[PDB]
Structure 1
Amino acid sequence: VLSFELLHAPATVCGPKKSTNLVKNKCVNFNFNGLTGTGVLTESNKKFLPFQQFGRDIADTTDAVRDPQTLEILDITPCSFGGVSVITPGTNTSNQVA
């Protein structure tokens, strides 16, 4: 008979864990240890100390993460994005646009 007791102590006996393959150099949705986001994951030389899990830029925005399944310190670029603007001559003269 297998018994299970749950108290106020933190649970240290779990089972298998949530994860996927890790894709570099493409725009991707991601989660690292509960840090969710989306962007282009990339390699880095950023020297995280052994206890450090995440990295931040001057304006507090995340710029790097530890892969919990390897030694990899990734750098996270945001999604490539920008305003789209339409160049047009006046419609009275032509319908062409760029």
Structure 2
Amino acid sequence: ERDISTEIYQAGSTPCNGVEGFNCYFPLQSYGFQPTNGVGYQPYRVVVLSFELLHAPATVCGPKKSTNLVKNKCVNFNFNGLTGTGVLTESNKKFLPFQQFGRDIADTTDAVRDPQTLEILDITPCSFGGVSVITPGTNTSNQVAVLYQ
């Protein structure tokens, strides 16, 4: 927050009413800057950059060479910082014009809107599973079968 108010400080129990009298101080005081001073006297120019995320479609960020779009083969993607891996495919869930991307019960993103062509795409993580081994025992033989579940 910013404050440009200029009113007489009234810490004491005396109504100043803009008199600048005893116990009536002026809250705003001035620096004294001269080159011939101490090591810690030199003025400093401070610039503070502040960010905010996940509030709107992105509008300020760096110059990376945007690549072509490939689908039906699960590859790494980077949609405005929303990194991840998975199959991208055509989507049938209609998006309202102001909506950007959809989420699911687990608060996981399964739909995105393409920033360039303005199209919706699905995100489905690659196929995966567990592997089990059927063996008769090394006491008998060394043949085994594999079960993908």
Query: If the length of structure 1 is used for normalisation, what is the TM-score?
Result: 0.77
- Larger Rg: 1 or 2? 2
Structure 1 residue 52 displacement after superposition: 1.7
User: What is the identity percentage for the equivalent residue pairs of Structure 1 and Structure 2?
Assistant: 100
Gaps of at least 5 residues in structure 1 are none
Cα RMSD for the two superposed structures: 6.0
Q: RCO (CA 8 Å, sep 6+): is it higher in 1 or 2?
A: 1
Structure 1 residue 18 displacement after superposition: 3.8
Instruction: Give the match's secondary structure for 2:137.
Output: coil
- Partner residue in 1 for 2:98: 51
Alpha carbons of structure 1 residues 12 and 68: separation in structure 2 relative to 1, 3 Å: closer
- How many angstroms apart in 2 are the aligned matches of 1:68 and 1:10? 9
Alpha carbons of structure 1 residues 11 and 25: separation in structure 2 relative to 1, 3 Å: closer
Gaps of at least 5 residues in structure 2 are 1-47
Structure 1 residue 51 displacement after superposition: 2.2
How many residues align structurally? Answer: 98
Alpha carbons of structure 1 residues 89 and 74: separation in structure 2 relative to 1, 3 Å: same
Structure 1 residue 7 displacement after superposition: 23
4+ residue runs over 3 A deviation? 1-18
1:19-75: per-residue Cα shift (whole Å, max 9, x none)? 111111111100111111101111101111222221111221111000111132101
Query: If the length of structure 2 is used for normalisation, what is the TM-score?
Result: 0.53
- Partner residue in 2 for 1:28: 75
